[PDB]
């Protein structure tokens, strides 16, 4: 069962492109191990967590309500909108939109939530304002990461993402209720079964968020640990290859197995 760094390097040998990885201790924030920690990768759908962090920050500031209902029309729908496409008559609450963006990777939900904050540049401003001067969102879904490769637009680094996720889940950046709501949505993720979850032993906690481009890229962010409580953050990104989705998934699952077996 290869050591995690050995397995990450092997994944990159087999896939082509780059694989980036970091593991942080959740309590201390210390980097436990990493590979390409400071290199840029496309965020893909992993940004949806950060988006909902910004929404929750607005809640905490008295500027938004999770119960506020948003109506939208057929013309607002984009690709990969399995939840929002079923609510054209009734609309969805802000909190429902975050649940759908996080748990189902719903793209229209994410775009609606981006409208609530004024667009991708405002999410960047939110990240900047929490001390992340690396991560940037510039585009909407689904063009995010599909229109001509890393111009630094729509990218993060493993360390920036892991650091920022730790601050959202543990900091007093968010209120206790909002921190808990964010991790609850990640825990309820429905679409990342083939990834880290496939390696997870019974009894363990995981809160995660996956992402994909059609070709070349995959990723996941997670807070996980034994005995029902998260104790570490893991971020894995891969980009730049011509590997199949099955291949990409397999390699993330095998990195997961290594990190669990060598915990
Ligand atoms: B997202 O990664 O930006 C988004 C939706 C999506 C999420 C996931 C996941 O694992 O959470 C898997 C697949 C799609 N990506 C896209 O909209 C992207 N254009 C896309 C579209 C089709 C297939 C793969 C990627
Ligand atoms: Ca290499």
TrEMBL record:
Keyword Signal in annotation: yes
One Pfam short name: Beta-lactamase2
GO molecular function: beta-lactamase activity; metal ion binding
Chemical reaction(s) catalysed: a beta-lactam + H2O = a substituted beta-amino acid
EC numbers for this chain: 3.5.2.6
Location of the Beta-lactamase class A catalytic domain: 25-237
Family: Belongs to the class-A beta-lactamase family.
Protein name: Beta-lactamase
Lineage of the organism: Bacteria, Pseudomonadati, Pseudomonadota, Gammaproteobacteria, Enterobacterales
Gene: bla-TEM-94
